[PDB]
Design a protein around this ligand. Sequence first.
Ligand SMILES: *Cc1c(COP(=O)(O)O)cnc(C)c1O
Ligand SMILES: *Cc1c(COP(=O)(O)O)cnc(C)c1O
Ligand SMILES: *Cc1c(COP(=O)(O)O)cnc(C)c1O
Ligand SMILES: *Cc1c(COP(=O)(O)O)cnc(C)c1O
Lengths: 319, 317, 316, 316
Amino acid sequence: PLFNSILDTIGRTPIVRLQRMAPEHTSVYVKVESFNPGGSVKDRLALSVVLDAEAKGLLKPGDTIVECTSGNVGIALAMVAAARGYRFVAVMGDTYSVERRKLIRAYGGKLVLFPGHLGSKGGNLIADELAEKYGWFRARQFDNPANPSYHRETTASEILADFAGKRLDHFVTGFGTTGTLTGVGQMLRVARPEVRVVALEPSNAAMLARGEWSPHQIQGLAPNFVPGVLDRSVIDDLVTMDEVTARDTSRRLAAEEGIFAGISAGATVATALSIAEHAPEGTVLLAMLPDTGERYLSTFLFDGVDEGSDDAWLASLDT
Amino acid sequence: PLFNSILDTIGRTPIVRLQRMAPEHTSVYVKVESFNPGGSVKDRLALSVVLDAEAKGLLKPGDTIVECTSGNVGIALAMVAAARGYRFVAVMGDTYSVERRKLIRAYGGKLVLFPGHLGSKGGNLIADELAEKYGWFRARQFDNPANPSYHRETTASEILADFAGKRLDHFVTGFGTTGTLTGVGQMLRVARPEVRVVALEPSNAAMLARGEWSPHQIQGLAPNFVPGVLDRSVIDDLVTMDEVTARDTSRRLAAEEGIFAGISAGATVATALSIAEHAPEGTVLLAMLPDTGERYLSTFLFDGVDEGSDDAWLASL
Amino acid sequence: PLFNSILDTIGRTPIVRLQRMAPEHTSVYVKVESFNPGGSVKDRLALSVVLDAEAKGLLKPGDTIVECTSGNVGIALAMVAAARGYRFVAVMGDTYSVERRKLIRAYGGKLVLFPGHLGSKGGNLIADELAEKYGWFRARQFDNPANPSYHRETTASEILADFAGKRLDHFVTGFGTTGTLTGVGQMLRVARPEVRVVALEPSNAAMLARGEWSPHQIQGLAPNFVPGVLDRSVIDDLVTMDEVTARDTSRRLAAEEGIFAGISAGATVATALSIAEHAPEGTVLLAMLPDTGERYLSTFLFDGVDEGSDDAWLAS
Amino acid sequence: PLFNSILDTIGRTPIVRLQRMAPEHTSVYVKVESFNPGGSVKDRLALSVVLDAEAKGLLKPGDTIVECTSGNVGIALAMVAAARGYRFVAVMGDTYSVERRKLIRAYGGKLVLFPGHLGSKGGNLIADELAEKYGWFRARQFDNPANPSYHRETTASEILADFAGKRLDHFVTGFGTTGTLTGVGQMLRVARPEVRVVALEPSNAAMLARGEWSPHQIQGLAPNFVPGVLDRSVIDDLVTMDEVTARDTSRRLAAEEGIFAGISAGATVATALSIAEHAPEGTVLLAMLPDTGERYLSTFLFDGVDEGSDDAWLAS
Ligand SMILES: *Cc1c(COP(=O)(O)O)cnc(C)c1O
Ligand SMILES: *Cc1c(COP(=O)(O)O)cnc(C)c1O
Ligand SMILES: *Cc1c(COP(=O)(O)O)cnc(C)c1O
Ligand SMILES: *Cc1c(COP(=O)(O)O)cnc(C)c1O
């Protein structure tokens, strides 16, 4: 139980049961990836990507890593780079919450921002450019097979072990790099063919099911393209989810269950409740909670939330 | 295995070894309490007080809990209340950060603001008042024995079990409600008398060493009084730490080890290091890391932290 | 944390590294299934079979479970029966140790014996008669998909999780029901196709290699037929092991590493060492340790072990 | 995660709830020490005694450990030495179970038999002589502070952690070296002063009550002398248990709960049930289960076994 490195605490996250949000004749369990030291499921690929690189001789002590940090991946790489002795450089838009900025500089990352109006790929480009220019290492979160690999061996094993001999009918997840859905899905389809793998997409960005994509707010989900690490054959059910319904459900999870997660976590739970609403008696669902809601205080997850005293509420108590 | 409630994940936090921040002739271990669902050590006292009130029959379903808080205690109580189905009311000054407000509200907590300058003792009167006026339950983080009690049964147990049959010389911690220092200290006193219980406090608030308190920046540490839940006899070495040193140490922990923790965590690691410097060869130290640094962005933890790219360093060669 | 039933402790067994028995340029790990409450890997299929039957509505507390056994399955089933409120009847050949009899009885199980030479084929036939005659539930460990299924979900997950991000090159295991080999093997294929599935059989019972069988002494291994649960496609290297090398390797493990396991475990460890001897630097192997050697005392495992004092040694 | 050595799996044993043996108005939990690699709670003192000697410099590579044992201490010390690479020498009566010897032999331990009668302090001095004569290490289980220490740091910690924020009214345990009673009791007294520590003694061996000893059949308990490691200030209730009632409770535990433990385990559970019968509603008890019942196959725990075939029973 004594741990050598903080990176040894990655994975083995808890799966907990929702106490009141689910229909009584149903059971909805949830996987909290905020328990990872990085506060998100990205701790998995970041650690896997780097360990795979080292064993491949692509990374050496003191080396430098660079990637296009949309948010969590940057924080996880920064943490892993810091913990293993690497330098980390991430490229994020000029217009990106100053918090997602301070977080990276916290782990000692050297940040370089470009005009946000460059549609993301601008950094994704200056990533490989600055990479070969100095022989820097690129994670390639979207194409590095170590990503779905770590999920096959850890995430899936954790889910499989927890539900062994027990009932499980639905596994719900959204996708960004698609590593989670791919890895867990491949393991599930073989081990539990009966479990329906449910993949959700933001209502406006139904890339997979309609080739359409529009800037959404369900952070960490549906990027402007389809990752090559994806194995869509694993998907049993492809659905959509409104960013507002997802934001609202994330808020409910917090106030009604005490589980403070982000938007994509609200989306998965929303989809689960949806299926549960009309599901047969005794249906068991599992939803993925990708990260902590703590890094969302400055996003639409907190839009319309009172900041002052609850005078009105106090007043309603004496009348 | 599956967990029934999110509250069943509280505690059993990891103790990790610092990989490079400590003198090669020493081993410095760190207990990362940010792994608690609530992000801080307070998850323990929050759970303990509620489970305790329920057993004594002081908390029935749908009841509401009130507490004058400003930091992690309010977040923890709110989370626990949200998970147990209780209503929670946080009484805090308006001078306190807004982010702190959003956290308590995220968990469905009710906010009751009051003039900051009024100070703790002021808001405590407010909480006491509401509590009586409406018959709500008061946590009393500074006097509730269930607070240190839970550290004796969990925190201490985790430390003892991880170090069983292994060397351990110093256990370093600061104190707010002192629940951690008192509880773990009482168990170590019986199990490992050789371990020095090092209790640190802010220099400009060496409230115990020299009975002097004054606004410091090590959030969570040394209140302006002496908690009734404390047992001073447990302390072996009473020292002081500087907020700037604590702050820097914290920035190092994050950048050099990959462990992003609060300022009070920087303080303990700092004292642990100071002891490590001029210490026997092979000595082993354990320092408490109270919370996650993620809720310290609007703090002097990021005084002059670059908020924009540094294309200056971008060309060196 | 607290456990509700003893059955909730099944699985999640430890994998330990051999300290001195393996070639220095190599790493041999071992999965100790004796940590299961029932003392062997059989606790996995016994729990899984019963839980599946319950879900299917085929088993109801108070019902009677019957199964042909070589020893371990009987103990496991008997233990689970005692834990869930079921009656258990074991069909075993007299050939097996009376200490395997007391163990099944200790859990309150009932014992029905038949001529040892009939083998698993004969007992299965007997278990079946009794099943029809009394409406008893048949576990059918060689055909019940719940057997390999539980290994995919647990054993495999434990192995995959333990080695995530680490080097693993070989996985060695013998087979009886073939649940472990099939379950772990099929999941190894999906997650780590490179790893080589090494499947051993007793030299005198190469039912797969040469379709031959003959009463052997590596308990738990090679029945007189090919289990229907089996999926041969999972095996990369099919090898043989002599019972004496097995027996002696199990002794070495106990005396040189502090790990006291059975004979089949001696076999898998021997096979792993052999491979490791001529394997490239850094090769990592994992051997399955089916059970505790504590139930092999009155067995050839303790053939001629000095039951008397070695005053001679004291002479010096 | 992967374990470096087999010794790294010592401790952290599960606490499980009895399903049908306890009065419904009550809850009886049980700590199963048989989950230790060595099969008993002695794994804790054995490891602790060695790491302490090593740190103190009293043990160096190749050094040899000797101790007079016929029970679990020998087995535990035997395994530890085998994993640590020390030599182990056991001193026991030649009239003892040929299996108890086999166990020590399995772990590569040397055997020096001696007159059964002179058992007690005799075989001990024979080890005492060998100790100074050859410069060998003596554990001193009954007086070594490291025994209770390890219990205060692991056993007690596992109990306190599992019951944190939950009800716990009674802790029941017997004593041999008294290391468990002392260790768990000292930590219990500090964190949970209201939990009543119940120490039982065999009916004919009430050493603490009136200093009277007599040979009994509850293996592991009541030596013929009050151990120096004992702390009487932690005992709330001193009770006695009849060895037959213990033996029978052990049988019940296995057959009714699926938990196979030794005689002393039957004894503690017997005491817990007794306390539970007339205890207020909601009372929670925890009882220590010292070892596996698997090494009691040649003891009275198995008298009237009926090792044949349940042909008679089959008739109906
Ligand atoms: C990475 C991420 C996801 C999607 O997970 P993948 O494994 O990349 O499919 C969902 N939500 C958030 C907040 C993320 O960071
Ligand atoms: C509560 C707290 C402490 C002090 O812990 P106590 O157990 O109350 O003494 C230290 N740091 C932070 C950030 C805290 O929230
Ligand atoms: C059951 C058993 C095996 C073989 O395992 P399967 O999963 O049934 O193939 C090997 N050794 C022993 C001692 C066994 O009991
Ligand atoms: C050692 C032992 C005990 C008594 O435990 P102590 O901690 O030595 O007091 C009880 N039962 C058995 C079977 C034992 O081996």
